[PDB]
């Protein structure tokens, strides 16, 4: 049959394949090429000191056990092929609770080219820690990070790198800005080495620079405070003998100020 040719290609690829071992376990390091397409920078929760981000998480690595010779150079396969091969165990260091979307079918991608180069895209919604120093609140700016790296494989086993230039390896979509309080100024990346109890690991960093707006606070706090002070400023213009009127000016301004 016409479809038996690709079936036996996949069955020949998975024959004798150990998915528990990374490519070149005892011979080299598995370089993983990573880039991120942010489809929406979600709302920043100031109470939890966190932010939400939806991203296309793309990783690419060379595997030599997945070489084939056939009529099609790229095998655009589904998600069931992804669990049958080795994939890197990338996790977010400062993530709190993230969901990999699986509606309707697991939101994953797998493309095996003929030289063995892979590509593995995912949809995630990362709730990551953004520690905030609110000394200049509400006129503050933050650099909320997004740190990801391998969980089990050390620096001598799996290293991470950006597939494009580092200035162009985190792309934020134009319509994708769900920020209502802040506004996104730009991105900032950097690789690095983190020392842990187990060993040294390669952690890739993505700093999102934010800047809050006083819009909500120059109408809820600052302006009702100015109007409260000004309404106590008109009590000097009343009569001296009007004791209860200037008294109710004083007590109502003190109550409005303390309830604000």
């Amino acid at each position, epitope marked *: 049959d016409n479809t038996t040719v690709f079936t036996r290609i996949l069955d020949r690829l998975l024959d004798g394949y150990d998915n528990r071992l990374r490519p070149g376990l005892g011979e080299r390091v598995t370089e993983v090429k990573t880039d991120i397409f942010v489809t929406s920078f979600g709302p920043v929760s100031d109470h939890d000191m966190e932010y939400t981000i939806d991203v296309f998480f793309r990783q690419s690595w060379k595997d030599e056990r997945l070489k084939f010779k056939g009529p099609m150079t790229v095998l655009r396969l589904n998600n069931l092929m992804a669990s049958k091969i080795w994939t890197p165990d990338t996790f977010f260091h400062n993530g709190k609770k993230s969901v990999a979307h699986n509606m309707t079918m697991p939101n994953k991608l797998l493309r095996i080219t003929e*030289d063995g180069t892979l590509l593995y895209t995912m949809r995630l919604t990362v709730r990551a820690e953004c520690p905030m120093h609110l000394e200049d609140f509400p006129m503050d700016a933050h650099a909320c990070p997004l740190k990801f790296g391998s969980y089990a494989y050390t620096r001598a086993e799996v290293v991470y*790198e950006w597939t494009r*230039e*580092p*200035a162009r390896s985190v792309v934020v979509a134009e319509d994708g800005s769900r920020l209502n309080q802040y506004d996104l100024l730009g991105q*900032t*990346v*950097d*690789s690095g080495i983190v020392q842990s109890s187990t060993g040294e690991y390669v952690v890739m960093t993505t700093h999102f620079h934010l800047k809050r707006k006083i819009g909500y606070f120059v109408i809820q706090t600052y302006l009702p405070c100015i109007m409260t002070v000004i309404l106590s400023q008109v009590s000097f213009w009343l009569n001296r003998e009007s004791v209860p009127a200037r008294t109710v000016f004083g007590v109502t301004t003190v109550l409005t100020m303390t309830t604000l």
Partner: antibody
Amino acid sequence: VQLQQSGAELVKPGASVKLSCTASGFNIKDTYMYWVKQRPEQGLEWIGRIDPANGDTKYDPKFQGKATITTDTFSNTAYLQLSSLTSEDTAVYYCARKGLRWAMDYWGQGTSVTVS
Amino acid sequence: NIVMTQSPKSMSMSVGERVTLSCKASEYVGTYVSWYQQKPEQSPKLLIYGASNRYTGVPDRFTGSGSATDFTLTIGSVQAEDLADYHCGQSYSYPTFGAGTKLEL
């Protein structure tokens, strides 16, 4: 592991020159190939970028049009085209492999071009 | 573009003491600089990648360092065979290079 380039060239100004370097010991489809200009007693100047697996090329804005980068798969070779050669184009050219952490790992021996 | 402003042009000291270099970036490059050596009549060779990562074959005397904007390369007890020109480059964006720091006796 070795990047062997072409020889030295000497043509009249206003002409065109073919310049090439052959990579051995690996394949150029994995890493980017970077071209750089070294004027004598001056600093290095980056020419452009090529990704041979995708075929995409990115160039410096001051080198757009006068220079372009091509490649092929079977010979595992990166090429330059230079057009409208002038006196300030007299320099030595290296092709540099993209390395670990974007570092320009390997370098060629160098081809010196000269006009008269 | 990103502008590399490594200084000075050349330094002229003897053999066996500490000499440091400096590379200053116009815009942010985060730990993606690289340092090369340039002997007369010789192709460049890599020394440091990242910010301070020592390449294979580099002696231990060559110590680099870096930050978000300021970068440096410290030499401990420079010898006679190290008399060459040094280059600072970046690759956080499309790659650029500095002018060049030389060494003299």
